[PDB]
Design a binder for this molecule. Structure first.
Ligand code: MTX
Ligand code: MTX
Lengths: 328, 328
């Protein structure tokens, strides 16, 4: 069949632009014995792609995951109609030998969008789950500071915190996202772009300090939060989105004297560290909390594979409310 | 009784200079019931004093620990002749009620200098012990990077690593210190002030990266080490000496894409976190290893209390081979 594919025409300089992407059309070969042909239903765009694109050669397909369905099959374990998670990149059709695929939860109901398998009940949600429960290690009652809180990771971090008995403080970059998070049960939410002083806003948000810091942003924002950590405070380093598009050198590191005196623990992680039983268990817990209403979700769905570069750029700028998903 | 005290005349700018200190003489009050008069035998100078001095008021005594002897006693628990660790600051004589004192290990032998209680078999050695064995969590076979490696901390870090079955790489500030660490069993030792490229020297010392980083220095040196940590590498943040005498703005932080991609664990600590049986067992272990030859030591004894500022400045600049101690 035919397929459309987004490739990296030019390595990004600062924020990506439209000319950095090129759409190519091609004819895929026939299926070989044991292979399947997959048709993309929903594709995701995520901040990590900004970092990962730097390792590609120009002309290479953009990396990324998708929900797809088997439309032709020479693999009896993956008959036509099967829905799978696949990571062929930004492409509408692809061929897989079945080994790099992942079926959805067998209990996946029709009452939630399939696209949540790329979001709250997918890798972003699993990232919040392990970053909070394992890396931060919350037990109950802690005060958690989480930035980029309106994204699919931060929004799930705060809600898992709330249903575990923890106070939550969230930072976002738009008053529109401020209201969205209050509805989700966040104790405090503020717009970091507009607050007069971040240090004063954080101190008022919790004069007692912060036990845990789920950090997606990094940079100067993290230095301010670090100064307000309690002793033995834990920092989960999930991302540094504020530096991914940087043209200049990295900002100053956190004041080492504070870090040592407070004896902070700071561990970075990637969701792929957990597999097997641990990963399956977390997925089921996320699905359960979605059905029970403890974890709400919101999506920004963009129609058209042709608009994937636009969805990626809007997502990086925070212009989209909810998980940015492209519908093929 | 009379005493001499070194005070902070002016807050340091960059490295200290002789004019930043002022020696004073005073008359101590009579011993009340339950008190002792302590005569300093050995006083230590250590890098942390540079940071702590910023919090002092001008005129205040410089902080620090000493090995002292009871020369007059109204406390039956501390008779005349008892050797204690005390922290009255840079002073030759002081009065204590006994609650803030620490007796030496009951098994302390007459075959080692008493000044080791301020070094290898004191707080520097305990910092190396807990930092390496618990914060880094060396298990045997790992490769360890330790800077400020010729100090009492770094020298103990490397030798505990050697006796636990690890490969050890050490950076130092002078050619003379390179030879000393070679004799102690360090696998690789180098002078970071004279190498063409820090990145290349570290690569050659361990082409496959570093499992553990015992960090006393921070700054740019640590950014380079972080770029060569293995996946799940662990960093014990003990000090940030490169920033203590800094004059310019703080250096950039570590590249978070490397920290996240490698999933590094980075925890700061201070030796006071461990007390009681844990601290006492560590001290006995250090004493054992010294008596077995598994931990060699070197001291740079400067004679004269009047030379304590010079000892402190030479120690800060890397001029002294071995733990800097002032003999009263
Ligand atoms: C699949 N996955 C794991 C993950 C993490 N880091 C990686 N890093 C690299 N280099 N490569 C990977 N494949 C990779 N994968 C993900 C996917 C999305 C998000 C994430 O943070 N998504 C945004 C999406 C924001 C939005 O769409 O509005 C969020 O904040 O929820 C994190 C981890
Ligand atoms: C007593 N102690 C614990 C410690 C650590 N940080 C502190 N920081 C502050 N502000 N205050 C303290 N009392 C303090 N104490 C110490 C003492 C010395 C060294 C230390 O690093 N000494 C140098 C001495 C170098 C030399 O003499 O050559 C070394 O590397 O061995 C560390 C911890």
């Amino acid at each position: 069949s035919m397929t459309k594919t987004w490739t990296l025409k030019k390595h990004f300089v600062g924020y990506p632009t439209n000319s950095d992407f090129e759409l190519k059309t091609s004819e895929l070969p026939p299926l070989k014995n044991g292979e399947v042909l997959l048709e993309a239903l929903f594709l995701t765009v995520d901040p990590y792609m900004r970092v990962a694109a730097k390792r590609l050669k120009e002309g290479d397909t953009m990396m990324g995951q998708q929900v797809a369905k088997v439309v032709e099959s020479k693999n009896v374990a993956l008959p036509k109609g099967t829905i799978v998670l696949a990571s062929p990149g930004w492409t509408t059709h692809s061929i897989s030998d079945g080994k790099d695929l992942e079926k959805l939860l067998t209990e996946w109901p029709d009452t939630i969008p399939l696209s949540l398998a790329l979001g709250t009940v997918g890798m972003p949600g699993l990232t919040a789950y392990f970053g909070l429960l394992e890396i931060c290690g919350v037990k109950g009652g802690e005060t958690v500071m989480v930035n980029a809180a309106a994204g699919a990771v931060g929004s799930v971090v705060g809600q898992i915190a709330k249903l575990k008995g923890c106070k939550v403080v969230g930072a976002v970059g738009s008053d529109e996202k401020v209201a969205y998070l209050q509805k989700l049960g966040f104790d405090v939410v503020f717009n970091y772009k507009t607050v007069e002083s971040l240090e004063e806003t954080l101190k008022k948000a919790s004069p007692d300090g912060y036990d845990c810091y789920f950090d997606n942003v990094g940079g100067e924002f993290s230095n301010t939060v670090i100064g307000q950590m309690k002793k033995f405070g834990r920092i989960a380093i999930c991302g540094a989105i504020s530096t991914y598009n940087r043209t200049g050198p990295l900002p100053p590191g956190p004041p080492p004297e504070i870090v040592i005196y407070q004896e902070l623990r700071m561990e970075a992680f990637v969701v792929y560290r957990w597999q097997g039983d641990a990963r399956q268990k977390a997925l089921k817990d996320l699905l359960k909390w979605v059905l029970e209403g403890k974890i709400q979700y919101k999506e920004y769905i963009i129609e058209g594979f042709e608009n994937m570069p636009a969805a990626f750029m809007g997502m990086l700028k925070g212009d989209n409310l909810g998980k940015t998903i492209v519908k093929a």
